[PDB]
Enzyme design. Sequence first.
Site, short mmCIF file in Angstrom:
data_model
loop_
_atom_site.label_atom_id
_atom_site.label_comp_id
_atom_site.label_asym_id
_atom_site.label_seq_id
_atom_site.Cartn_x
_atom_site.Cartn_y
_atom_site.Cartn_z
N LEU A 13 0.56 -1.00 -0.18
CA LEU A 13 0.12 -0.26 -0.11
C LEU A 13 0.69 1.38 -0.22
O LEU A 13 -0.07 2.69 -0.58
CB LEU A 13 -0.91 0.23 1.16
CG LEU A 13 -2.13 -1.57 1.38
CD1 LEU A 13 -2.88 -0.86 2.40
CD2 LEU A 13 -2.59 -1.17 0.16
N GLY A 14 2.19 1.17 1.13
CA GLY A 14 2.84 2.58 0.68
C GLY A 14 3.90 2.65 1.32
O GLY A 14 4.17 0.82 2.43
N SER A 15 4.75 3.38 1.66
CA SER A 15 6.14 3.15 2.96
C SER A 15 6.20 4.28 3.04
O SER A 15 6.61 5.65 2.38
CB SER A 15 7.53 1.70 2.07
OG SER A 15 7.69 2.91 1.47
N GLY A 17 8.65 6.44 6.92
CA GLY A 17 8.70 6.89 8.29
C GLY A 17 8.20 5.93 8.94
O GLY A 17 8.46 5.43 10.40
N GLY A 19 7.68 2.91 8.49
CA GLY A 19 7.55 0.89 7.72
C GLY A 19 7.07 1.12 6.71
O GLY A 19 6.96 1.28 5.79
N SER A 20 6.57 -0.09 6.41
CA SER A 20 6.47 -0.87 5.04
C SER A 20 5.76 -1.69 5.12
O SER A 20 4.74 -2.60 5.81
CB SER A 20 7.03 -1.20 4.05
OG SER A 20 7.94 -0.55 3.01
N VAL A 21 3.65 -0.96 4.55
CA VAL A 21 1.90 -1.59 4.64
C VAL A 21 2.00 -2.33 3.31
O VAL A 21 2.06 -1.94 2.56
CB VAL A 21 0.89 -0.38 5.27
CG1 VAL A 21 -0.03 -0.81 5.71
CG2 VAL A 21 2.06 0.58 6.58
N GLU A 90 -6.55 -3.98 11.64
CA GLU A 90 -8.15 -4.14 10.81
C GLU A 90 -7.89 -2.89 9.75
O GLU A 90 -6.83 -2.36 8.62
CB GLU A 90 -8.92 -2.94 11.28
CG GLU A 90 -9.01 -3.53 12.01
CD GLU A 90 -10.71 -2.87 13.49
OE1 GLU A 90 -10.25 -1.60 13.64
OE2 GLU A 90 -11.38 -3.56 14.34
N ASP A 136 0.63 12.61 15.62
CA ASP A 136 0.86 12.73 13.84
C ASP A 136 -0.82 13.19 13.44
O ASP A 136 -0.85 12.63 12.49
CB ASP A 136 1.26 11.95 12.81
CG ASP A 136 2.65 12.09 11.58
OD1 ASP A 136 2.09 11.54 11.06
OD2 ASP A 136 1.87 13.48 11.30
CL LIG Z 1 11.19 0.10 8.33
#
Ligand SMILES: [Cl-]
Length: 275
Positions: A13-15, A17, A19-21, A90, A136
């Site tokens: 889905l994206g990445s 700061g 992490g990677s989702v 979720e 944030d």
């Molecule tokens: Cl990372």
Amino acid sequence: EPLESQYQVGPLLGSGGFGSVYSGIRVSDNLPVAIKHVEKDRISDWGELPNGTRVPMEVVLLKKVSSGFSGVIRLLDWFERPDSFVLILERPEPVQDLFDFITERGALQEELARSFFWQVLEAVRHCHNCGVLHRDIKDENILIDLNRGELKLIDFGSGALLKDTVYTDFDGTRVYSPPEWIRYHRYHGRSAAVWSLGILLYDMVCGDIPFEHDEEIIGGQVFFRQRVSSECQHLIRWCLALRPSDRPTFEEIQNHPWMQDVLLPQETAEIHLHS
Ligand SMILES: [Cl-]
């Protein structure tokens, strides 16, 4: 008890700061999930959660907000690997983040902004009750469930436990950060949250954030580029008071004239999102 057995991983889905989702599905029951990885080496902030071993602070914060229903994305599970942590979270479906949504649709009609803003306010009041400061709050950290008309908060990875004493650390988004942070590197939780909420509300009704550079943030003059009602401009300009203690509490925001007669989430989707 592997993880890649319990979850079927889908696309990235994206990445950034955070992490990677990835998109995934719980294999058990087809439940949509989000699968977020972060290198241990890249984890600045660490906790231990009432039980007692070593996790990222983000897991401690998520566990604290993930109890019962709310407008926060709940933590469903998490895994320690040799060089990283994986969180299962979720995933609404269909979903659009509010940044995407405002980029594509432009400035929100006041009635829709009001229902969105109201739900954000409930979600933040929820975190605060749980002892959690998000740090944030911004459009991109707000997921819209397009069918249910419900907003959900994501990305607690720069949050902290809420306290009544000063914060001297910040690593959220600068442009939603308050002038006392820019000028002094000192802020208090609730009042800095309130500023970022004035930024978000301005962004919803105008289609862009009010301030780009440090000098604007600290000058705090609000120029409206779109047509906005006086009662809305007033609320925004309140949230964006230069003195922290001149900002409204959550109660004052939610008692503001502009905030009356909010739609329900279902009515919201029916009128504005169905399509
Ligand atoms: Cl990372």
